[PDB]
Amino acid sequence: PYAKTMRRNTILRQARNHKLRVERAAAALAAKSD
Amino acid sequence: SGRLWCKAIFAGYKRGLRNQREHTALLKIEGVYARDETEFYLGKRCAYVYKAKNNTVTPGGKPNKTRVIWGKVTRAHGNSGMVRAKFRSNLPAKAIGHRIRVMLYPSRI
Amino acid sequence: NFAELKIKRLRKKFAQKMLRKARRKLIYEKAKHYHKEYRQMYRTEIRMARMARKAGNFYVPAEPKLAFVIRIRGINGVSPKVRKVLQLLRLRQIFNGTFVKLNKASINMLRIVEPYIAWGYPNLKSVNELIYKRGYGKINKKRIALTDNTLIARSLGKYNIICMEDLIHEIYTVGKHFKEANNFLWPFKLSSPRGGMKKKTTHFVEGGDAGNREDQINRLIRRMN
Amino acid sequence: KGKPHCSRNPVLVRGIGRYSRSAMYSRKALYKRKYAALATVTKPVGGGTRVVKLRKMPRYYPTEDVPRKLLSHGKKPFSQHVRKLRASITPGTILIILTGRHRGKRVVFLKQLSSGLLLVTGPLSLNRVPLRRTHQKFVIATSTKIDISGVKIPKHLTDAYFKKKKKYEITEQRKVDQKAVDSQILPKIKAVPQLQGYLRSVFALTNGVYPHKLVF
Amino acid sequence: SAHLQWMVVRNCSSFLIKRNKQTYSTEPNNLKARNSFRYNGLIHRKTVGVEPAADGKGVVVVMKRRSGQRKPATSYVRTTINKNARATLSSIRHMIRKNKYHPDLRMAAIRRASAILRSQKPVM
Amino acid sequence: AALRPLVKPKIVKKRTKKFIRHQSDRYVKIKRNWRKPRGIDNRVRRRFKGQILMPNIGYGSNKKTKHMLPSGFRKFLVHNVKELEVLLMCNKSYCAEIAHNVSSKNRKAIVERAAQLAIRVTNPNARL
Amino acid sequence: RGLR
Amino acid sequence: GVDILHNKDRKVWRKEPKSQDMYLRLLVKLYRFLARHTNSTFNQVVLKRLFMSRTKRPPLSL
RNA sequence: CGCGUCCCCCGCGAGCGCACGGGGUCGGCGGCGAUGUCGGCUACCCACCCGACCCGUCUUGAAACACGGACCAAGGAGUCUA
RNA sequence: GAGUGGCGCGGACGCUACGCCGCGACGAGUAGGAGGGCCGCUGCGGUGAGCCUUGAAGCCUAGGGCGCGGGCCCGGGUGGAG
């Protein structure tokens, strides 16, 4: 049963990390405009 | 009008050397000569069109002498754009090196 | 006048129902604690190594508790001693798999049937899918599929192995009831390696498939499972 | 007395809610919404009065009946099936009907109907194709798309509208509906250069032309 | 007793008819007409028979009386039911349910009578 | 307007060809009736490739559709009118068949009675 | 009795 | 290919009496029912003995 | 996720409905057909592909340059007694 | 599990118990052994109010089938007495 909770936590974690990575890439593009 | 199918050759059955499995055909579709280009044709409908002495019915037409064994391109065969097909009746060895029509209309594009 | 036995038969059903919910919550929280263990287990091996490396020393990690032994040779033209050791491992068919916990009375058997087995130290994910996908229990000496936890709870409940997760924990972290938990598992009916064997006849060291493959059993478990 | 609400935890994955059942018990207000513990009708007759029976016993039993079959779950009827499109079949794309009596004809797509089938209109002026349904599988979607978003397709031309009732005679409703929709599309296809002629032409495979090589 | 004289009859009765991997029993009071303990129309104390009439139309119901079972001549009371189908199938249900008279043969007798009233109905 | 069975399942047969006897082709003395080759060097006995197949138990038909006709019924062979009422309650599963040596006047009774009892006959038009 |  | 010796994978006990007498066979039908249903291990041993040959159930003297 | 009470640090609430839930259904349709077509796995003849040596027998080993067999019908061999 | 104590007349199938149903595993085979034949043959005791000159046995068959198989059932032709 705990599998659903583990999977949900992993998916949320992964989405958060992807958003962070996108934000870092945007910052790199801003630096690469400066 | 124009042609709505691609030129394949019944290039023998799925076979080892000293055993052949007549249930699966090996199709050589003209143009595709690698496993990269055989991916479009997977799941497509393939027809062996022949004609006999006696007239038989035609769906949406008057009785021709032309007949079919309908099939399906199941998966890729080997490394060089050869493809496996599996017909509702096992293709006759009369048809070896003769034209079968790999259709377009289990279309995914 | 049936007003009693109407509700009394419901009172039974509710007590049966609320009891499963308590058993479900235990299974849920045992599953949450083993996650916490496997984390701490996986983390501390990297930790002990880093503090060994900082000091300039070496952390020689714990010689593994647990092996997964796969039979690679067939049933024809086989030595009598090799026949016996392969059928004490319950490897009575080609590509049958069993977990075998390491010691002296394990490895001197596994080295004697080296040419007929491909074995190594399985992962956590390897122990998961082998127990989840290929998991069958010897219940009444019959190979019955582990589809509800009440088949593991009925055979292994007397050792407090009461769900699929407890079994995985018992195998991977070789528990005090490993024998009873591992002998419960029917020798795993694995398919042919999807990708191909390198060479069945020779040892893995000499570009073959046979014998001890320490980390590398997991690549062929995923090739076969 | 209480009117229904939309499900609060959004669908993160199919069969998983975004919120846990502690984050959900929170949202559903269960912390403050606690709770403690046919057949016969009498008709008159002008004699006595009769007690007649709704769904009475049968007059015939056959020599053997089949048993009640077991209960499978995920097997919905076709009226309840989920209806998928290809992402290439966007409302406004120009298709190539492969298999019909209109085989090869370049045809303007309109909308996915409420029975899986594509409502399609190869202008009856150009293609000689009516308001007609087509199946997704028997139709190629091209990189040829007109700005169709702002044409008003009628509501009443639905799945049951095109269903074969029973020598077919065209109803004068079907002729008005062709002209009603053709008056909106056919000006916006002439807006694009050489497109009115492209729809007129039929699709054809020829020598040295391989469908995997033409990317469209 | 029933279970005794079954073990004599089960394989060697004159009514028992074996061919085509199938077994039947051509007894006066077997209904479903198959070689069985349940449906055997000689061997039980209580036996329900459903036959068509000695005239053309109707169903006769043969109830084997409890008393004289070593008396073959007086052992059966025959009642002909020449009514509508729905109330013929009812009467046979009421003879078996509401006399408790061998209630295992309640549905078999109603299915037989149904197939007799279907038989004596004219074909087009 | 023929008789329908209870269930009409897809009668799947593992093999439809006869298991003809080994060297029944070469000789007239040797019948097509199968005999197991028990010779010490027989190709057919010891399972050589491209040889005559032997009847194993593996070829056994599905127990549900075993003895089932193309119509979806089983045969029960009938000699007189008295042996039809046998089938009047196993009507939708088992069909009647009138035996070869039943006379022309006596089929006319069995065909006409099977019409009344709704029993199917495999050979109703056989003397006339 | 906790959920009464 | 599984290395199983099919030598001893048929158990050679009686699962009925070889006798065709119907008074003994009705006693088996009764103790078929009692042995499996009643958890008593008595009726199981009796059922087994109802099967056994003349020699295997010898005459117990008074 | 109450509190009616028992203490170590300061025994049954009612409903509804969706389903990755103990083995498939559709509440989807579509062409055709009375003198020439529809069905028929088998069976008749033919063709093609792959396979494929002639059986019985004694024998370590037989397709054998080992022996018996031109062909067909009928007969023909573990019996009865102690 | 029991006791004295504070309207609507209804419910499929089944169980030849030598029957029926369920679940796991397994399947080479000469010499050889055993089991099961609703395999076949010819006579006997029973039985099937069996079949038969309105056509038995036999025989033929590019007819329809059944059975894993031994074989068997039908249709047509021939035949004349079981």
From Swiss-Prot, chain B:
Modification type N6-succinyllysine: residues: 62
Keyword Cytoplasm in annotation: yes
InterPro entries per the UniProt record, alphabetical: Ribosomal_eL33, Ribosomal_eL33_CS, Ribosomal_eL33_sf, Transl_B-barrel_sf
Keywords noted in UniProt: Acetylation, Cytoplasm, Ribonucleoprotein, Ribosomal protein, RNA-binding, tRNA-binding
Locations listed in the record: Cytoplasm
Domain of life: Eukaryota
Keyword set includes Glycosyltransferase: no
One Gene Ontology term, aspect cellular component: synapse
Any single biological process term in GO: translation
Entry's Gene Ontology molecular function annotations: structural constituent of ribosome; tRNA binding
Residues the record lists as N6-acetyllysine modifications: 7, 62
Family to which this protein belongs: Belongs to the eukaryotic ribosomal protein eL33 family.
Function: Component of the large ribosomal subunit. The ribosome is a large ribonucleoprotein complex responsible for the synthesis of proteins in the cell. Required for the proliferation and viability of hematopoietic cells.
Subunit organization: Component of the large ribosomal subunit.
Protein name: Large ribosomal subunit protein eL33
Gene name, Swiss-Prot/TrEMBL: RPL35A
UniProtKB/Swiss-Prot annotation, chain D:
Molecular function terms, GO-annotated: RNA binding; structural constituent of ribosome
Residue list for modification Phosphoserine: 72
UniProt modified residues of type N6-succinyllysine: 43, 152
Gene3D superfamilies, A to Z: 2.30.30.30
Modified residues annotated as N6-acetyllysine in this record: 167
Coiled-coil residue spans: none
UniProt key word Cell membrane: no
Keyword hit for Ion transport: no
Subunit-level organization: Component of the large ribosomal subunit. May bind IPO9 with low affinity.
Name of this chain's protein: Large ribosomal subunit protein eL6
Gene: RPL6
Curated annotation (Swiss-Prot), chain F:
Any one GO molecular-function label of the UniProt entry: structural constituent of ribosome
Pfam family membership, one: Ribosomal_L32e
Sequence positions bearing N6-succinyllysine: 49
Recorded coiled-coil stretches: none
PROSITE patterns reported for this sequence: RIBOSOMAL_L32E
GO cellular component, one term: cytosolic large ribosomal subunit
GO terms for biological process, alphabetical: translation
Compartments reported by the entry: Cytoplasm
Crosslinked positions (Glycyl lysine isopeptide (Lys-Gly) (interchain with G-Cter in SUMO2)): 8
Keywords: Cytoplasm, Isopeptide bond, Phosphoprotein, Ribonucleoprotein, Ribosomal protein, Ubl conjugation
Positions of modified residues (Phosphoserine): 61
The family this protein is said to belong to: Belongs to the eukaryotic ribosomal protein eL32 family.
Summary of the function given for this chain in its UniProt record: Component of the large ribosomal subunit. The ribosome is a large ribonucleoprotein complex responsible for the synthesis of proteins in the cell.
Protein name: Large ribosomal subunit protein eL32
Provenance organism: Oryctolagus cuniculus
Gene name of the record: RPL32
Swiss-Prot record, chain G:
Subcellular location: Cytoplasm
Family, as annotated: Belongs to the eukaryotic ribosomal protein eL29 family.
Function description: Component of the large ribosomal subunit. The ribosome is a large ribonucleoprotein complex responsible for the synthesis of proteins in the cell.
Subunit details: Component of the large ribosomal subunit.
Annotated protein name in UniProt: Large ribosomal subunit protein eL29
Organism: Oryctolagus cuniculus (Rabbit)
Residue window of the full protein shown: 114 to 117 of 245
